[PDB]
Design an enzyme around this catalytic site. Structure first.
Site, PDB file in Angstrom:
ATOM      1  N   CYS A 108       0.814  -1.217   0.000  1.00  0.00           N
ATOM      2  CA  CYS A 108       0.000   0.000   0.000  1.00  0.00           C
ATOM      3  C   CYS A 108       0.839   1.255   0.000  1.00  0.00           C
ATOM      4  CB  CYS A 108      -0.932   0.042   1.213  1.00  0.00           C
ATOM      5  SG  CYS A 108      -1.836   1.612   1.349  1.00  0.00           S
ATOM      6  N   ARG A 111       0.233   4.490   2.998  1.00  0.00           N
ATOM      7  CA  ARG A 111       0.387   4.258   4.437  1.00  0.00           C
ATOM      8  C   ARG A 111       0.812   5.443   5.319  1.00  0.00           C
ATOM      9  NH1 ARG A 111       4.026  -0.707   4.769  1.00  0.00           N
ATOM     10  NH2 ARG A 111       4.504  -0.340   2.534  1.00  0.00           N
ATOM     11  N   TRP A 280      -9.113   6.519  -0.293  1.00  0.00           N
ATOM     12  CA  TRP A 280      -9.460   7.230  -1.511  1.00  0.00           C
ATOM     13  C   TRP A 280      -8.512   6.769  -2.618  1.00  0.00           C
ATOM     14  CZ3 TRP A 280      -7.939  10.035   2.946  1.00  0.00           C
ATOM     15  CH2 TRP A 280      -6.594  10.432   2.958  1.00  0.00           C
ATOM     16  N   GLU A 285      -5.142   4.001 -10.552  1.00  0.00           N
ATOM     17  CA  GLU A 285      -5.967   2.810 -10.299  1.00  0.00           C
ATOM     18  C   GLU A 285      -7.143   2.738 -11.268  1.00  0.00           C
ATOM     19  OE1 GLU A 285      -6.438   1.555  -6.015  1.00  0.00           O
ATOM     20  OE2 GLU A 285      -6.132   3.716  -5.662  1.00  0.00           O
TER      21      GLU A 285
HETATM   22  C1  HEM Z   1      -6.307   6.535   2.182  1.00  0.00           C
HETATM   23  C2  HEM Z   1      -5.778   6.529   0.947  1.00  0.00           C
HETATM   24  C3  HEM Z   1      -5.167   5.257   0.307  1.00  0.00           C
HETATM   25  C4  HEM Z   1      -4.484   5.253  -0.841  1.00  0.00           C
HETATM   26  C5  HEM Z   1      -4.158   6.490  -1.715  1.00  0.00           C
HETATM   27  C6  HEM Z   1      -4.084   3.890  -1.121  1.00  0.00           C
HETATM   28  C7  HEM Z   1      -3.361   3.436  -2.204  1.00  0.00           C
HETATM   29  C8  HEM Z   1      -3.202   2.105  -2.542  1.00  0.00           C
HETATM   30  C9  HEM Z   1      -2.891   1.594  -3.865  1.00  0.00           C
HETATM   31  C10 HEM Z   1      -2.711   2.473  -5.128  1.00  0.00           C
HETATM   32  C11 HEM Z   1      -2.794   0.258  -3.788  1.00  0.00           C
HETATM   33  C12 HEM Z   1      -2.508  -0.685  -4.978  1.00  0.00           C
HETATM   34  C13 HEM Z   1      -3.920  -0.987  -5.467  1.00  0.00           C
HETATM   35  C14 HEM Z   1      -3.987  -1.872  -6.671  1.00  0.00           C
HETATM   36  O1  HEM Z   1      -3.163  -1.684  -7.599  1.00  0.00           O
HETATM   37  O2  HEM Z   1      -4.898  -2.741  -6.699  1.00  0.00           O
HETATM   38  C15 HEM Z   1      -3.042  -0.131  -2.409  1.00  0.00           C
HETATM   39  C16 HEM Z   1      -3.034  -1.411  -1.892  1.00  0.00           C
HETATM   40  C17 HEM Z   1      -3.432  -1.820  -0.637  1.00  0.00           C
HETATM   41  N1  HEM Z   1      -3.965  -1.020   0.384  1.00  0.00           N
HETATM   42 FE1  HEM Z   1      -3.920   1.104   0.329  1.00  0.00          FE
HETATM   43  N2  HEM Z   1      -4.541   3.085  -0.106  1.00  0.00           N
HETATM   44  C18 HEM Z   1      -5.229   3.885   0.798  1.00  0.00           C
HETATM   45  C19 HEM Z   1      -5.870   3.414   1.936  1.00  0.00           C
HETATM   46  C20 HEM Z   1      -5.851   2.137   2.484  1.00  0.00           C
HETATM   47  C21 HEM Z   1      -6.543   1.707   3.695  1.00  0.00           C
HETATM   48  C22 HEM Z   1      -7.444   2.628   4.552  1.00  0.00           C
HETATM   49  C23 HEM Z   1      -6.257   0.406   3.906  1.00  0.00           C
HETATM   50  C24 HEM Z   1      -6.706  -0.536   5.058  1.00  0.00           C
HETATM   51  C25 HEM Z   1      -7.184  -0.128   6.243  1.00  0.00           C
HETATM   52  C26 HEM Z   1      -5.361  -0.023   2.839  1.00  0.00           C
HETATM   53  C27 HEM Z   1      -4.821  -1.290   2.683  1.00  0.00           C
HETATM   54  C28 HEM Z   1      -4.261  -1.781   1.518  1.00  0.00           C
HETATM   55  C29 HEM Z   1      -3.904  -3.165   1.267  1.00  0.00           C
HETATM   56  C30 HEM Z   1      -4.046  -4.384   2.218  1.00  0.00           C
HETATM   57  C31 HEM Z   1      -3.352  -3.184  -0.158  1.00  0.00           C
HETATM   58  C32 HEM Z   1      -2.835  -4.423  -0.915  1.00  0.00           C
HETATM   59  C33 HEM Z   1      -4.045  -5.198  -1.432  1.00  0.00           C
HETATM   60  C34 HEM Z   1      -3.582  -6.519  -1.973  1.00  0.00           C
HETATM   61  O3  HEM Z   1      -2.492  -6.989  -1.548  1.00  0.00           O
HETATM   62  O4  HEM Z   1      -4.318  -7.091  -2.819  1.00  0.00           O
HETATM   63  N3  HEM Z   1      -5.152   1.048   2.000  1.00  0.00           N
HETATM   64  N4  HEM Z   1      -3.284   1.025  -1.680  1.00  0.00           N
HETATM   65  N1  LIG Z   2      -7.161   3.424  -3.255  1.00  0.00           N
HETATM   66  C1  LIG Z   2      -7.121   2.206  -2.635  1.00  0.00           C
HETATM   67  C2  LIG Z   2      -7.286   2.116  -1.254  1.00  0.00           C
HETATM   68  C3  LIG Z   2      -7.221   0.873  -0.628  1.00  0.00           C
HETATM   69  C4  LIG Z   2      -7.000  -0.263  -1.413  1.00  0.00           C
HETATM   70  C5  LIG Z   2      -6.926  -1.525  -0.830  1.00  0.00           C
HETATM   71  C6  LIG Z   2      -6.701  -2.657  -1.619  1.00  0.00           C
HETATM   72  C7  LIG Z   2      -6.552  -2.537  -3.004  1.00  0.00           C
HETATM   73  C8  LIG Z   2      -6.309  -3.786  -3.839  1.00  0.00           C
HETATM   74  N2  LIG Z   2      -7.018  -3.782  -5.102  1.00  0.00           N
HETATM   75  C9  LIG Z   2      -8.232  -4.400  -5.190  1.00  0.00           C
HETATM   76  C10 LIG Z   2      -8.725  -5.184  -4.144  1.00  0.00           C
HETATM   77  C11 LIG Z   2      -9.974  -5.811  -4.224  1.00  0.00           C
HETATM   78  C12 LIG Z   2     -10.746  -5.652  -5.366  1.00  0.00           C
HETATM   79  C13 LIG Z   2     -10.259  -4.875  -6.420  1.00  0.00           C
HETATM   80  F1  LIG Z   2     -11.000  -4.723  -7.537  1.00  0.00           F
HETATM   81  C14 LIG Z   2      -9.015  -4.248  -6.332  1.00  0.00           C
HETATM   82  C15 LIG Z   2      -6.626  -1.270  -3.585  1.00  0.00           C
HETATM   83  C16 LIG Z   2      -6.844  -0.136  -2.792  1.00  0.00           C
HETATM   84  N3  LIG Z   2      -6.914   1.087  -3.369  1.00  0.00           N
END
Ligand code: HEM
Ligand SMILES: Nc1ccc2ccc(CNc3cccc(F)c3)cc2n1
Ligand code: HEM
Ligand SMILES: Nc1ccc2ccc(CNc3cccc(F)c3)cc2n1
Ligand SMILES: C[C@H](O)[C@H](O)[C@H]1CNc2nc(N)[nH]c(=O)c2N1
Ligand SMILES: C[C@H](O)[C@H](O)[C@H]1CNc2nc(N)[nH]c(=O)c2N1
Ligand SMILES: [Zn+2]
Lengths: 409, 413
Positions: A108, A111, A280, A285
């Site tokens: 992520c 973070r 958000w 994405e």
């Molecule tokens: C608040 C703004 C946030 C932004 C800008 C952001 C951004 C991202 C992005 C761009 C990815 C890659 C997504 C993809 O390509 O599918 C990602 C992955 C991920 N995010 Fe964040 N995220 C945010 C919030 C969060 C929150 C609130 C959580 C959990 C409480 C979280 C947990 C995760 C996890 C577990 C992944 C990896 C998912 C996987 O391994 O399939 N994110 N995030």
């Molecule tokens: N902007 C964000 C915020 C949190 C996220 C958490 C996980 C993922 C992983 N991508 C995902 C997960 C489940 C279904 C799907 F279509 C994409 C993307 C996030 N993207």
């Protein structure tokens, strides 16, 4: 067992990782084979050390390691695991656990926001109707008229595995996808199967290109039930371009709230199979993956045509030009409608700052370069040149099987 | 480890099964508890370390020519064994040298151009004794590989390491690179990546033109002696001025690059033998020049100047002015090479070919080690097929390896 150094090759900044020494879960790699690009690599007896480990780091985190309260909590937990084969988290532990799962999410890029997470305790939920209610409240709180706020709603933990709570949707808000008689796909092809499942369950499809799917909610191991999200809770953004006035004619839009609902939250050995969470979007994405993946909306060809580009040879980079323009449109559209979004330049810069914070205050930050680096313009963002170490810390978000592969009706 | 490891393509759903990983030879730096996949870089062998490495290689070789366990195989084993016993090293046959060189390329997990691995012209320079002779060999290599724009891949292989005090080395990181000069005001002229090497050359006696695109001299070390300077004949250095199909002003930027990418600082390891000087060359993928050489902040760094001429709004990042300029630059690079009839491949074509190559290798060889972090191009990652491809990275031998820069180790005479 060494301090490991990571280097940024652009800034020459070297950080020292000690945190990896505390990790206990496996990466999927071995001494001989690296698996960094593979996407997907209890009992009382098992439970207590896992529980103790978590309580230990919790009390260590509030500077009360070895306190009266610390030992009492340990006593309380073992004695509870003993009698009931499980245990219940304190509200404080639940909130700590959830924030740290996000903090430890190596994939992520967002973070830097980890400690700003609104935690909704839904552990008293018993039915799909109750799940629906908690989810509506989550969506309403998180959307916040476009000023998005990070949130997670946590449903009851797994017990025997025959009574799981699951949100069958992969996200709370997604578009339906339809197989057409002519073999093409209408809408989002990634959801074709899920859409069929909803239809079979009685959902009446509008059969449009961007139909918001109903919620499919499973409580306590029972058959999942369908619900329609109140439409006024569903914030969407029509996509237009700041220079090309024809772009709006593509009829594209997307939703403001990315709310992943199919992951598993693990805290102290306890498993929360239903823990939908949201933040958000980073522009790419939607603009790169959702719109431009061949297996998704796949719009590059259409856009480049309207751009009147030469599409006969790949070496004109027509795909690349149209890609940037689509991503400009997404960012411009969200910004104009005052919906929170972050571009990949801003997001990756914050991540580098976040890494530096984590090495300084925690001795490391687990990071998965393959996921952190954006799907376009990789090397013109700072994370490309940043060496990262990946390792698995708990609490964590884990993958779990799709519910239709396990459920008996 | 199990005998079978599976990889999926998330775009095509194609699944491949790897067995080749069982032949992995060295560590990756990763463990069960930590992955080091984004880490850049994670005194001779004894008689007894050498016997098994030679045998491993000779077996592989005779197995490849379908003569495994043959009389010729066993007689080759015995010859090599005695030679190691009586001299503490051995000499590869020409056929084994050519086989080994090609396979070091075949095994290079970070290389997206491996569909070409079997077409490699191998120049045997093991008779070389002096730096002048090194220069001669290198000139012939550059001329052959360049081929007036129709580039052909080649490698030139100098004598193997003996006691470690008589190493042959090319001090240059590539045979053809541009000088960088640090100014007293802190600015850099030319290529900032080459400042240190440039300073060493100047110290050895090079008279620099002090321009933006000055081809560096060769700094060549034979048989452990102090390195010597030679100027590559300029007629051997094919270059391409960069212009743009739509932007007439793009020529005004005064950009050019060289046609021939020829890496010269790696070590070639075949059957436990170490060739410390083995310059090789292929041809460019556009992004190497248009993204990294030109747009990296610590390199030529032209995005801002290009963006200003495109008259982009450069006040917010979210205008994606950087991304916009980056594409036009890569268009110009590809257009200029093609127009000048110099071999080059765009990232779409290269990654598409690599996927097919990889699939063929899984079928004929039981696998294809690949480093996703390097294979995926520095721009437009997810719109190339490799982004969606799962890969397994592991180290097979023969292989190309990193080695310490020679100015850090060289005992000056
Ligand atoms: C608040 C703004 C946030 C932004 C800008 C952001 C951004 C991202 C992005 C761009 C990815 C890659 C997504 C993809 O390509 O599918 C990602 C992955 C991920 N995010 Fe964040 N995220 C945010 C919030 C969060 C929150 C609130 C959580 C959990 C409480 C979280 C947990 C995760 C996890 C577990 C992944 C990896 C998912 C996987 O391994 O399939 N994110 N995030
Ligand atoms: N902007 C964000 C915020 C949190 C996220 C958490 C996980 C993922 C992983 N991508 C995902 C997960 C489940 C279904 C799907 F279509 C994409 C993307 C996030 N993207
Ligand atoms: C024929 C056309 C070729 C193409 C298009 C090609 C392409 C590439 C590219 C784009 C990279 C990434 C380099 C970077 O980003 O810095 C690379 C790396 C590499 N290539 Fe190839 N290459 C070709 C020929 C060769 C040949 C002939 C050899 C050796 C015989 C070779 C061996 C390697 C090795 C060992 C690496 C990794 C280098 C490192 O770890 O620093 N390549 N190649
Ligand atoms: N087009 C090619 C062909 C072969 C290559 C081999 C190695 C590298 C690695 N890049 C590199 C290696 C050493 C020095 C240097 F300046 C760049 C790039 C290649 N690029
Ligand atoms: C094969 C590879 O692991 C897979 O395509 C990954 C690559 N990197 C990614 N990075 C992000 N952020 N999201 C993804 O879905 C993927 N997909
Ligand atoms: C930190 C990171 O490992 C480093 O910047 C790598 C990333 N991937 C790369 N990929 C290629 N082809 N070439 C490179 O130089 C790099 N650099
Ligand atoms: Zn690894």
């Amino acid at each position: 067992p060494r301090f490991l150094k990571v280097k940024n090759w652009e800034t020459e900044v070297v950080l020292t990782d000690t945190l990896h020494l505390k990790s206990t879960l496996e990466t999927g790699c071995t001494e001989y084979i690296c698996m960094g690009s593979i996407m997907h690599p209890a009992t009382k007896d098992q439970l207590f050390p896992l529980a103790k480990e978590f309580i230990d780091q919790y009390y260590s985190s509030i500077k009360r390691f070895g306190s009266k309260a610390h030992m009492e909590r340990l006593e309380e937990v073992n004695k509870e695991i003993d009698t009931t084969s499980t245990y219940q988290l304190k509200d404080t532990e639940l909130i700590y656990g959830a924030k740290h799962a996000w903090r430890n999410a190596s994939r992520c890029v967002g973070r830097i926001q980890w400690s700003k997470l609104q935690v909704f305790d839904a552990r008293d939920c018993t039915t799909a109707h109750g799940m629906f209610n908690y989810i509506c409240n989550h969506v309403k709180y998180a959307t916040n008229k476009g000023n998005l706020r990070s949130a997670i709603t946590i449903f009851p933990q797994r017990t025997d595995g025959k009574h799981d709570f699951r949100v069958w949707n992969s996200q709370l808000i997604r578009y339906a996808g339809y197989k057409q008689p002519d073999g093409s796909t209408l809408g989002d092809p990634a959801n074709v199967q899920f859409t069929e499942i909803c239809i079979q369950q009685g959902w009446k499809p509008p059969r449009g290109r961007f139909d918001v799917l109903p919620l499919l909610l499973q409580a306590n191991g029972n058959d999942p039930e369908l619900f329609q999200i109140p439409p006024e809770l569903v914030l969407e953004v029509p996509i237009r371009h700041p220079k090309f006035e024809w772009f709006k004619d593509l009829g594209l839009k997307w939703y403001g709230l990315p709310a992943v609902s199919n992951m598993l939250l693990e805290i102290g050995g306890l498993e929360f199979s239903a823990c939908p969470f949201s933040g958000w979007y980073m522009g790419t994405e939607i603009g790169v993956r959702d719109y431009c993946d061949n297996s998704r909306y796949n719009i590059l060809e259409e856009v480049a045509k309207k751009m009147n580009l030469d599409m006969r040879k790949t070496s004109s980079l027509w795909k690349d030009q149209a890609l940037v323009e689509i991503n400009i449109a997404v960012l411009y559209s969200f910004q104009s409608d005052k919906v929170t979004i972050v571009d990949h330049h801003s997001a990756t810069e914050s991540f580098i700052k976040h890494m530096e914070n984590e090495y300084r205050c925690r001795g490391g930050c687990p990071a998965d370069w393959v996921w952190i680096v954006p799907p376009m313009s990789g090397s013109i963002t700072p994370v490309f040149h940043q060496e990262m170490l990946n390792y698995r810390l708990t609490p964590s978000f884990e993958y779990q099987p799709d519910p239709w592969n396990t459920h008996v009706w």
